[PDB]
Amino acid sequence: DAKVFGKCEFAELLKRDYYLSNDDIKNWVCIAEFESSFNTAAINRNRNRSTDYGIFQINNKYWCGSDYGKNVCKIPCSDLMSDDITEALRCAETIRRDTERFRGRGKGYSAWVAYNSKCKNRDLDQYMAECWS
């Protein structure tokens, strides 16, 4: 069985193992909830022949996979579908970094459909209250 995190378990992991800031954490937890229900083996085969991979549903058209589209994260997409989230996180931070680059300061997370609909402009301190309270 592929890893499915609890929300607070996922929050505590990003803090304990990756020393992420609260701002980073509240944003990644929210994005993971609504992209994949924190399921590391979540995968979605789209109509456009592309695939979304892992807890951050990263798309093989731009971000992973030598054989299809581009490979900006320079990683096989399988590496983003793992019990261990290191490469998922490393690649999400690159997606956030590049998006911010082209879109403008503080717009990094707008690369995610879940971010735009469920997380942007929300009080993610309230959202995290059940974990941080």
Side-chain angles (χ1 to χ4, degrees), residues 20-116:
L20 295 200
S21 68
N22 286 356
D23 191 70
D24 285 12
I25 287 165
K26 67 194 197 183
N27 279 299
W28 289 130
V29 169
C30 189
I31 291 163
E33 193 185 322
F34 296 107
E35 291 283 354
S36 69
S37 307
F38 314 97
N39 170 28
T40 65
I43 195 179
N44 278 278
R45 295 186 182 88
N46 302 322
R47 287 269 189 65
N48 73 143
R49 287 192 183 175
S50 74
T51 297
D52 298 319
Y53 292 87
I55 194 157
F56 296 133
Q57 287 291 292
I58 293 154
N59 190 261
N60 58 349
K61 178 147 280 213
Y62 313 104
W63 301 117
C64 58
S66 280
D67 58 291
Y68 185 91
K70 304 288 177 197
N71 196 4
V72 166
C73 288
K74 288 296 137 79
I75 201 78
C77 297
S78 56
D79 281 340
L80 305 192
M81 201 147 49
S82 166
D83 284 4
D84 182 297
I85 64 143
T86 308
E87 295 283 16
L89 179 55
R90 189 175 290 129
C91 182
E93 289 179 333
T94 298
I95 293 170
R96 196 190 53 217
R97 186 177 26 265
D98 289 8
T99 297
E100 174 155 69
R101 164 124 283 179
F102 285 97
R103 223 93 95 142
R105 311 274 150 274
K107 307 233 327 190
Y109 298 110
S110 72
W112 281 271
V113 182
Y115 174 80
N116 293 330

